[PDB]
Amino acid sequence: ILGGREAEAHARPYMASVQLNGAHLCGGVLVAEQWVLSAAHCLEGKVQVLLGAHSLSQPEPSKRLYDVLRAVPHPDSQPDTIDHDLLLLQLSEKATLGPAVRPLPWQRVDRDVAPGTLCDVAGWGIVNHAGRRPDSLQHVLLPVLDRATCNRRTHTERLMCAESNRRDSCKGDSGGPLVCGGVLEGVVTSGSRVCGNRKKPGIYTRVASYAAWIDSVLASA
Ligand SMILES: N#Cc1cccc(CC(=O)N2CCC[C@H]2C(=O)Nc2cccc(Br)n2)c1
Numbered sequence: 001i002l003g004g005r006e007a008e009a010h011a012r013p014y015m016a017s018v019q020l021n022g023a024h025l026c027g028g029v030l031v032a033e034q035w036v037l038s039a040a041h042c043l044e045g046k047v048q049v050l051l052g053a054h055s056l057s058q059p060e061p062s063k064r065l066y067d068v069l070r071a072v073p074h075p076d077s078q079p080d081t082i083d084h085d086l087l088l089l090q091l092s093e094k095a096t097l098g099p100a101v102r103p104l105p106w107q108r109v110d111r112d113v114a115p116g117t118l119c120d121v122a123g124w125g126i127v128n129h130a131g132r133r134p135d136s137l138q139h140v141l142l143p144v145l146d147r148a149t150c151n152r153r154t155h156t157e158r159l160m161c162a163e164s165n166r167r168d169s170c171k172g173d174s175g176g177p178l179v180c181g182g183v184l185e186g187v188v189t190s191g192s193r194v195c196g197n198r199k200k201p202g203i204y205t206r207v208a209s210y211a212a213w214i215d216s217v218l219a220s221a
Helices: 147-152 207-218
Strands: 015-020 023-030 035-038 047-051 064-073 087-091 118-123 138-143 159-162 177-180 183-188 202-206
Touching: 015 035, 023 047, 023 183, 035 183, 035 207, 047 087, 087 207, 118 183, 147 159, 159 183, 183 207, 202 207
Parallel strands: none
Antiparallel strands: 015 023, 015 047, 023 035, 035 087, 047 064, 064 087, 118 138, 118 177, 159 202, 177 183, 183 202
């Protein structure tokens, strides 16, 4: 997260850290008791998920790490694209929910967010262009752009864009949430891109666009 501020401890309880060998790799969103939604190139090996956290390092009453039973990348995703860039991770066991750990509702209604709406993006991604990794969760409020602006700058119905005027998501915020009026609208994409540049907006997979896939995987809870 660039141009942001420290999040308040535990105030965003859906936030997950997707990890490889005890290192934060990707954002994720608790979307059910045993499933975390992330991006498809996060996975790409022994994968684990950390819930309940503000600091990555420090002892906190609510922190807990989990193993992964099963990775289900979208079957049309390809290594070389950010099309269908979603990933469902089945935890090895159901998570212990509470004030600091709970699922965030995701947008089932296939409708665009109102342009200019400030949504909230959080992550343990880099907080500067020298790639500094924050211990504690950061966040930043960001305005959503209209679909036409999203098509022109960058280049489909399956992606959305947000303004990035030195405030942006970046590397390691991948797989993480764009939250708008308390609801998950975007999943930060997981291919590399320029961050913090007005002209090259951040890109987010429209979760609504994949309602049928997500249901069909979780159709077995
Ligand atoms: N730049 C850039 C960039 C912007 C969005 C997404 C990505 C891809 C990314 O961040 N990935 C690919 C999956 C592994 C993950 C990653 O590299 N995480 C990572 C790596 C170093 C530091 C931190 Br914090 N996080 C890169």
